[PDB]
Structures are given as C-alpha cells and as structure tokens.
Amino acid sequence: ENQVYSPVTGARLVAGCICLTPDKKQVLMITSSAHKKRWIVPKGGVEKDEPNYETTAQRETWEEAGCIGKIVANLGTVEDMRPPKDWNKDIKQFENSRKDSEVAKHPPRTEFHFYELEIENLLDKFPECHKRHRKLYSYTEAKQNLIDAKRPELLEALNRSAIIKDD
C-alpha cells in the first residue's frame, strides 16, 4: 500500500539506475529475485513519501546492488509491455495488419524512470547482499543478459546510456 501507480494507465511507477564505471566500459547488473539465474539492473516501486524519481532510483541501487554514485543523466521512461499472467489461456490473443503482427492492446504493467549513474563505490554489505549477486558486464555481455532475462525495455534503457558499445 506504499506503491504509486500512473493515474492514467494504472501502471506501477518504478525508478532505477544504469550504473556505469567512470570509463563507461561496463554496467552493474544484479540477479533477479523472481528468477535467480537472470541478470537485470536495479529498480523498484516509487513510495508515496518519495519527492522525485532520482530518490527512488538511488534508494533501489543501494538496497539491491550496494552501489553509491552520482546521477549524470536522465535516460527518460521505458514500459514493461509484457501481457498479463491470465493471457496465455485467453480466446483473443494477437492483432494483424497486412504487413505486421502485434499482441492484443493492453496497458503497461510498469512505467520505468531510468537515470545513468557514475559508480563512486561498491560496498560488500547492503540490504539485499545475501539475496542477490551483483557484477559488472561489458555492453555485449549486458545486452545478452537482458535478452536472456526477456527484458527488452531494460535493454532500451541501457542503450540510451553513454556505455561504450564498440567492444
């Protein structure tokens, strides 16, 4: 009941960080709690008392990755467009238009507000440090992790960052 939702779409409002090394060659990823073998980036629900998305983003980056640094860019918004859980056994599923196919119209699950952070410190002890792993990855490696994790929206956030893509 601390959770904030879009007054328009009902999507849950979430903020997180693309945390880059000063040389911009690697990004910090954490293992998912829902899927322990899948590598994602730190993010979490904005809480009712938080005054801005930067606050949520830096709180989640500390709670989930033991990462501290400074926000150096606003990477804007991306949306979790994954269908509902009930969808799989539904009657109508897809919409087709002559030269393309799309999944049937639905509201986003989540609206993500992402910021790029320059890592200033990684600490060995942090709130979720026994419940998650956290590791730096080059662009090529991070990109493959996020496809494997089935999170293209997190890949879109990574691609807006200043991470060096010429590995």
- Residues flagged as binding site: 12, 32-33, 43, 60, 64, 80, 82, 109, 132, 151, 153
Q: Which positions touch Mg ion (CB under 5 A)?
A: 44
72 CB-near residues (< 8 Å, 6+ apart): 116, 117, 118, 162
Closest distance of CB 44 from Mg ion, Å: 4
Across 19-44, b (16+ Cβ under 10 Å) vs e yields bbeeebebbbbbbeeeeeebbbbbbb
Pick between residue 44 and residue 152 the one whose CB is nearest to Mg ion.
44
Q: In angstroms, give the least distance from the CB of 84 to Mg ion.
A: 20
| Closest separation in Å from C-beta 96 to Mg ion | 35
> How many Cβ atoms sit within 10 Å of the Cβ of residue 60?
23
Q: Is-contact 68 62, C-beta < 8 A?
A: yes
Which residues are documented as binding site for Mg(2+)?
43, 60, 64
Residue with nearest beta carbon to Mg ion: 44
Nearer to Mg ion, 40 or 119 (CB): 40
